[PDB]
Amino acid sequence: MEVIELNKCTSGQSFEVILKPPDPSLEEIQKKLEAAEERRKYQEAELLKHLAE
Amino acid sequence: REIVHIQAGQCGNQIGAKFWEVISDEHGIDPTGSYHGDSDLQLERINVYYNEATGNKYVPRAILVDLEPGTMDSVRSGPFGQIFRPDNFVFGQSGAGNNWAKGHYTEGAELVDSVLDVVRKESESCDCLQGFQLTHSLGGGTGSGMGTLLISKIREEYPDRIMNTFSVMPSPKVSDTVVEPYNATLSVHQLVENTDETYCIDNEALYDICFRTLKLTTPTYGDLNHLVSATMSGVTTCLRFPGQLNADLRKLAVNMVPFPRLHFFMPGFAPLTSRQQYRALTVPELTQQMFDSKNMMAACDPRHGRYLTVAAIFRGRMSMKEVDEQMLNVQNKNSSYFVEWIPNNVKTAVCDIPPRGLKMSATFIGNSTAIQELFKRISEQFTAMFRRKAFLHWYTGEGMDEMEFTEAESNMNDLVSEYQQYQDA
Amino acid sequence: MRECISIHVGQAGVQIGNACWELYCLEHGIQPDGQMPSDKTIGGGDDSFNTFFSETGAGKHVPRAVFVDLEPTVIDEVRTGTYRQLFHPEQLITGKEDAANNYARGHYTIGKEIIDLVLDRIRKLADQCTGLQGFLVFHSFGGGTGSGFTSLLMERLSVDYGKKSKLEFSIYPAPQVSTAVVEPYNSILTTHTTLEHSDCAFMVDNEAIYDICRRNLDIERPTYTNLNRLISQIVSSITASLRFDGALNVDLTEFQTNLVPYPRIHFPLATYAPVISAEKAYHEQLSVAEITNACFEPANQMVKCDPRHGKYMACCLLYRGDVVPKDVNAAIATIKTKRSIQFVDWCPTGFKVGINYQPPTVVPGGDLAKVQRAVCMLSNTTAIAEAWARLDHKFDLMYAKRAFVHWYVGEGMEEGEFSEAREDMAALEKDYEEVGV
Amino acid sequence: MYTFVVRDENSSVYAEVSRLLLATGQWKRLRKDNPRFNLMLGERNRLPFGRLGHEPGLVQLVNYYRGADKLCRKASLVKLIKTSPELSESCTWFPESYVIYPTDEREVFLAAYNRRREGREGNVWIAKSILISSEASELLDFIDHVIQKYLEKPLLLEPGHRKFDIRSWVLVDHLYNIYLYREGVLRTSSEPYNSANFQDKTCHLTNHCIQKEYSKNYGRYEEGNEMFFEEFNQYLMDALNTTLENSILLQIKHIIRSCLMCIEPAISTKHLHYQSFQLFGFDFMVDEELKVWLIEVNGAPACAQKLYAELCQGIVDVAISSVFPLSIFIKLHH
Numbered sequence A: 001m002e003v004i005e006l007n008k009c010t011s012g013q014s015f016e017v018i019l020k021p022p023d024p025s026l027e028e029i030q031k032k033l034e035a036a037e038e039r040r041k042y043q044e045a046e047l048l049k050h051l052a053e
Numbered sequence B: 001r002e003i004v005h006i007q008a009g010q011c012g013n014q015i016g017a018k019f020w021e022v023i024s025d026e027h028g029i030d031p032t033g034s035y036h037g038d039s040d041l042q043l044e045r046i047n048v049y050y051n052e053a054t055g056n057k058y059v060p061r062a063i064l065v066d067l068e069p070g071t072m073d074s075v076r077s078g079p080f081g082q083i084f085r086p087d088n089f090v091f092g093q094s095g096a097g098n099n100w101a102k103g104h105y106t107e108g109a110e111l112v113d114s115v116l117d118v119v120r121k122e123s124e125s126c127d128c129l130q131g132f133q134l135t136h137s138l139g140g141g142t143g144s145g146m147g148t149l150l151i152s153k154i155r156e157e158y159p160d161r162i163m164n165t166f167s168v169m170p171s172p173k174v175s176d177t178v179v180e181p182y183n184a185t186l187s188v189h190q191l192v193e194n195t196d197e198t199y200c201i202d203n204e205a206l207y208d209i210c211f212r213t214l215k216l217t218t219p220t221y222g223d224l225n226h227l228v229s230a231t232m233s234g235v236t237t238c239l240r241f242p243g244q245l246n247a248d249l250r251k252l253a254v255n256m257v258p259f260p261r262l263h264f265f266m267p268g269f270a271p272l273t274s275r276q277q278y279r280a281l282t283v284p285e286l287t288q289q290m291f292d293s294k295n296m297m298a299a300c301d302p303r304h305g306r307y308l309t310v311a312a313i314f315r316g317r318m319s320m321k322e323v324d325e326q327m328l329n330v331q332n333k334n335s336s337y338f339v340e341w342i343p344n345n346v347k348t349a350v351c352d353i354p355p356r357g358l359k360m361s362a363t364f365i366g367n368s369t370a371i372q373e374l375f376k377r378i379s380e381q382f383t384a385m386f387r388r389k390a391f392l393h394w395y396t397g398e399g400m401d402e403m404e405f406t407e408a409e410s411n412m413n414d415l416v417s418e419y420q421q422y423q424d425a
Numbered sequence C: 001m002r003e004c005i006s007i008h009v010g011q012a013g014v015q016i017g018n019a020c021w022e023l024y025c026l027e028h029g030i031q032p033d034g035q036m037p038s039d040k041t042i043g044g045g046d047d048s049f050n051t052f053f054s055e056t057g058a059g060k061h062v063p064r065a066v067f068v069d070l071e072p073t074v075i076d077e078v079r080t081g082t083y084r085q086l087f088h089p090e091q092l093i094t095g096k097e098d099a100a101n102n103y104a105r106g107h108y109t110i111g112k113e114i115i116d117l118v119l120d121r122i123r124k125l126a127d128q129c130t131g132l133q134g135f136l137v138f139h140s141f142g143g144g145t146g147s148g149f150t151s152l153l154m155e156r157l158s159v160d161y162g163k164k165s166k167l168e169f170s171i172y173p174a175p176q177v178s179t180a181v182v183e184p185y186n187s188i189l190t191t192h193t194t195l196e197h198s199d200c201a202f203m204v205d206n207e208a209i210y211d212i213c214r215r216n217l218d219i220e221r222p223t224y225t226n227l228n229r230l231i232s233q234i235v236s237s238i239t240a241s242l243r244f245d246g247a248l249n250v251d252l253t254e255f256q257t258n259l260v261p262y263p264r265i266h267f268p269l270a271t272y273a274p275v276i277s278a279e280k281a282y283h284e285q286l287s288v289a290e291i292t293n294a295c296f297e298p299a300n301q302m303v304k305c306d307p308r309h310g311k312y313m314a315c316c317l318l319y320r321g322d323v324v325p326k327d328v329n330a331a332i333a334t335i336k337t338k339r340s341i342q343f344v345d346w347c348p349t350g351f352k353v354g355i356n357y358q359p360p361t362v363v364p365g366g367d368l369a370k371v372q373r374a375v376c377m378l379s380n381t382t383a384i385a386e387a388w389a390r391l392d393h394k395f396d397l398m399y400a401k402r403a404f405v406h407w408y409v410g411e412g413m414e415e416g417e418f419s420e421a422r423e424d425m426a427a428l429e430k431d432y433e434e435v436g437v
Numbered sequence D: 001m002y003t004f005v006v007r008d009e010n011s012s013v014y015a016e017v018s019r020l021l022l023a024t025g026q027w028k029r030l031r032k033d034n035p036r037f038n039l040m041l042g043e044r045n046r047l048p049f050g051r052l053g054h055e056p057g058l059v060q061l062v063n064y065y066r067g068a069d070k071l072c073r074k075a076s077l078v079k080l081i082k083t084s085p086e087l088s089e090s091c092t093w094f095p096e097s098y099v100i101y102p103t104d105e106r107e108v109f110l111a112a113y114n115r116r117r118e119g120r121e122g123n124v125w126i127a128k129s130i131l132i133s134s135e136a137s138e139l140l141d142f143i144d145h146v147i148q149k150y151l152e153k154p155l156l157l158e159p160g161h162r163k164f165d166i167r168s169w170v171l172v173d174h175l176y177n178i179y180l181y182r183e184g185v186l187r188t189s190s191e192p193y194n195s196a197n198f199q200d201k202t203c204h205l206t207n208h209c210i211q212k213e214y215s216k217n218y219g220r221y222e223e224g225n226e227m228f229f230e231e232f233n234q235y236l237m238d239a240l241n242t243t244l245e246n247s248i249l250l251q252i253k254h255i256i257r258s259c260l261m262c263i264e265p266a267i268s269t270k271h272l273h274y275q276s277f278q279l280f281g282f283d284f285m286v287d288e289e290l291k292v293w294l295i296e297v298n299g300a301p302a303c304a305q306k307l308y309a310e311l312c313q314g315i316v317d318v319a320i321s322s323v324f325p326l327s328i329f330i331k332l333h334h
């Protein structure tokens, strides 16, 4: 039961008790966002082609 | 999030008219378009189905379509006939003769562009259109043949919008002509491809409910449309009133449709009481009847298949706590009838505003694999005639070939087998 | 003084945000118009509450917050709410149609079209900061916006604010209030994409909050309002050290230092006590030992799980009210000799304690009774992996049949992203295994 | 209508339990992967405790205590008795044991073995996780586990001069009440105990498998080498002039309480979101001084053929019906 690092202020206090010792770049993100948009556009064009038949 | 409503053919316009009569009463709208309600819950989502024109009047966002003026004349002279926008009456004169080819390929093709002009005008005024709902039968010619032609062209012009239908399925017990299985089979394939949600309303089930349960000795079409009107009000409650679950057409589809083609729902309603009507129901009674086959509108036995998804909507002032435990009671008591590979597939919603004439009601929306019994029934009736090419000349006379019938037959058999795949998995 | 910006995404994020900022104003004595009588420096400040509030020349204290939702119905409630004067229009961002409980719709389809607007509005608040230290992001796991758009924002925040810390307050899905069957899909998808971009994340299971509201508050059918006022108490006790004078968890960096030794294991468990129904006219005021003991009762945890069958990597005790260190030490000593508190070997068995003398503030007319002392325990225990197991199991059931997958592929997402996300969660569960067993 | 699932098909005890539940008309068995159950008869290994207690409107009960493995494994039991102050390393009813890894206590086991050789005391030890030897070298070489003192002077049942161990069944319910089954059994050896030749482990190991495979007199003095309590109580009265209750059962009830109370704070489901119960199998040995020793605890025991019906019905009444309503037990108060 060792109490360490006791800091006291008017608002309260804090301390520690011890009981025992022991990213994608902007380009890579834009690439993935536009790839998904192209797959959406491709699926929509195939539907319009199917409806044109 | 506006919905554009379309009603096509005799059945679609007669059922569509009753639907607008019922929900206009619930939202406090009179036949002149004026509001006379006592709660703001009636107006909070009124714009989903109504346009507000000048003078603080509400005009339904509804388009009335037919190849014959007869039924739509009756609508214009009906109770709420004056509430409909006069320009939204689009009709021809020749009729469709209960012929899918006439609705889809010849007579209907001549009229469809004028309907799409009205659809376009109603859509241009929507702040953010979310989709369309169509009411029609599958056994006739205009609603079935021209309705599915309409759905195809609407999808082409609005590919990113939700398409929802209330589709009345024919039955030899309530039949007008012998070609209804032909018309139903041709249009079911259209619905498989071009709608996101379809409420399967079987006229046999409506007849049996009117006769066996409601004790109506001689059911009329008006009696059948009473049930449909009450069912349509229930299944659209979550769209018309404030709520958290299935509040729009796309979230409903996401919750109800685990596979794109399997979007054919069994609707149900409770209470269904013969005329007693004054007896108050309890939440356990509402929940038991709502899941009972005798309250289903598709004439399929749910115990012959499994539930993929279920939407439940309780209306009225009731114990929300007791609602939750009764819903859990149903699932935990008969858990073999729900697929285990979709956890928590039963979603419940509660609305405080009850339907007219009732203090409490429950509406059932189920995506059950037992709906394959409906498509199998139509398929047997189709094959019994098509095997002898009987009555085909009505269709080949309009330019169709036998091959298109063979393909429609194979498509609906494929759909039946697709339901069989997920009933055992 | 270093500022913090709060971001609220989706319905859950926005509604919880409105409950927290209401509570912050009550705690700091900020009137609904934005005035703060106890603030003698008008038009500017350099003290602790200025980390969450900017100041106008007219003395208005403005939250450093941005609200974003793809549907305007929830944010419009903020525009007309009690604290409408606090926010200016640039802080509130709405779309026309939502993500429809679809991660791919929120991340790819709608996220791509609105991500630049959100970042621009965040840049405006960031440009008002003298030394911005990072972001607190409130969102749900199950919603299409809360899951899909949040992961896109966290990516762009790591890009545009590489040195800043990012903390999450995340709502784990519970079928008792859940609005979608695909919420397990969205939860795992957004955890896979956000994991590398979040330094510390506090998960809140709606199931746990639901039952605490039923048992401790005697609410038969808890609403989002009941849940959010309770969640706001927890979040307030977690952020209190950033908004008040003190020495524990004084900046966002110390949250990772004190609670997250291993970067991927950054989901501390929160436990709060006491929760007393305001409908009770009188209640026996619990002692320091009694509220500290309740921190090890699973019925008080934000995620129902069993810390006895895991291992602790860190443990913080955050007290509010009439508490002195002597009673805390005596409470901890007696608890060690009655409970299973096993730490990993490469960490010291101990507790970091923070005490704020001001008792917790309750919303007047709320469900929570004012108490003389309260505590929130933040413990990084491997037992929280039980929540990942439940979630991954539900994912496996639906995905084995590809149920609902077409909704995601239809928005441009590849089906392989499902498998990448599930494999990442599988590695995550293994990490908790080799640390806690 | 309560619901339950079965996830351990090779369990003879709970196969009868589930059969009894179905025979009440108020229980329905679901598919093993259906989560909407009231009762789980779970698998032995890797029971998913973390998925229990998360089903709205379902009180969920499981037939295993998470964490009870600390008591039902040889190595963990020795660690538990040494480390826990409630049991302590000076525990008198448990044989001197040491955990040997092939932390490791190989230097302490030799320190005690050398201490025994210094005093010319009985230096026979047994290893298991089996080799009985009088030299520490032969034991450590065989491992490359736990080595404990072999009871060189056990109580020998006459006629036969033979060895025996006592199996006690214990049921702990969701309230952590400890119920001791009134009907125990004695797995007797049918071969005379022989202090010479400890490798002939037919008279030295009372396992029903070994006695049914190598013992010549298997089924002579008692069927299946299983003597019930009534006959054994009569023997102690005729031979030793005492009763089973005084000479043995008091020590048995004492050991069961000490073991289960020691782990109660670690495994109790008192305020947990799901409830647990579990059937245990305690194995005891008796020496010639009528002192009882604890051998091991089994987490998934199998009953005796005669008692397979009484105990399983007792499990339904005490552990299952107490949670889901529709004495053969000795309640050990604590």
Ligand SMILES: Nc1nc2c(ncn2[C@@H]2O[C@H](COP(=O)(O)OP(=O)(O)OP(=O)(O)O)[C@@H](O)[C@H]2O)c(=O)[nH]1
Pocket: C009, C010, C011, C012, C013, C015, C016, C069, C070, C098, C099, C100, C101, C102, C106, C140, C141, C142, C143, C144, C145, C146, C147, C171, C172, C173, C174, C177, C178, C179, C183, C206, C224, C227, C228, C231
């Ligand atoms: N605790 C709490 N949970 C909420 C709240 N609102 C929604 N949720 C939960 O969040 C999940 C749904 O996510 P939402 O935030 O509503 O959805 P969204 O982020 O707006 O995304 P979309 O509506 O699909 O565009 C469900 O599990 C709800 O139970 C809230 O106010 N408080």
Ligand SMILES: Nc1ncnc2c1ncn2[C@@H]1O[C@H](COP(=O)(O)OP(=O)(O)CP(=O)(O)O)[C@@H](O)[C@H]1O
Pocket: D095, D126, D128, D129, D148, D149, D150, D151, D164, D165, D204, D205, D206, D207, D283, D285, D295, D296, D298
């Ligand atoms: N320390 C000891 N002294 C004397 N005999 C012992 C002993 N340890 C074990 N034995 C004998 O060896 C037998 C088996 O011991 P062990 O503890 O390995 O049981 P086990 O796990 O092999 C089968 P079970 O599941 O029935 O307990 C005991 O029945 C006992 O007769």
Ligand SMILES: Nc1nc2c(ncn2[C@@H]2O[C@H](COP(=O)(O)OP(=O)(O)O)[C@@H](O)[C@H]2O)c(=O)[nH]1
Pocket: B008, B009, B010, B011, B012, B014, B015, B096, B097, B098, B099, B137, B138, B139, B140, B141, B142, B143, B144, B168, B169, B170, B171, B174, B175, B176, B180, B203, B206, B221, B222, B224, B225, B228
């Ligand atoms: N439920 C119901 N079904 C109808 C109604 N009118 C016609 N039907 C059914 O619809 C089919 C006939 O199609 P119909 O709509 O009359 O022809 P259409 O004008 O060409 O679309 C048959 O199956 C009839 O049983 C009605 O008012 N209510």
Ligand SMILES: [Ca+2]
Pocket: B094, B106, B107, B110
């Ligand atoms: Ca013509």
Ligand SMILES: [Ca+2]
Pocket: C039, C040, C041, C042, C043, C044, C045, C046, C055
């Ligand atoms: Ca100031």
Ligand SMILES: [Ca+2]
Pocket: C158, C162, C196, C197
């Ligand atoms: Ca980073």
Ligand SMILES: [Mg+2]
Pocket: B010, B011, B140, B176
């Ligand atoms: Mg007709």
Ligand SMILES: [Mg+2]
Pocket: C010, C011, C071, C098, C099, C143, C145
């Ligand atoms: Mg939303």
Ligand SMILES: [Mg+2]
Pocket: D296, D298
């Ligand atoms: Mg054993």
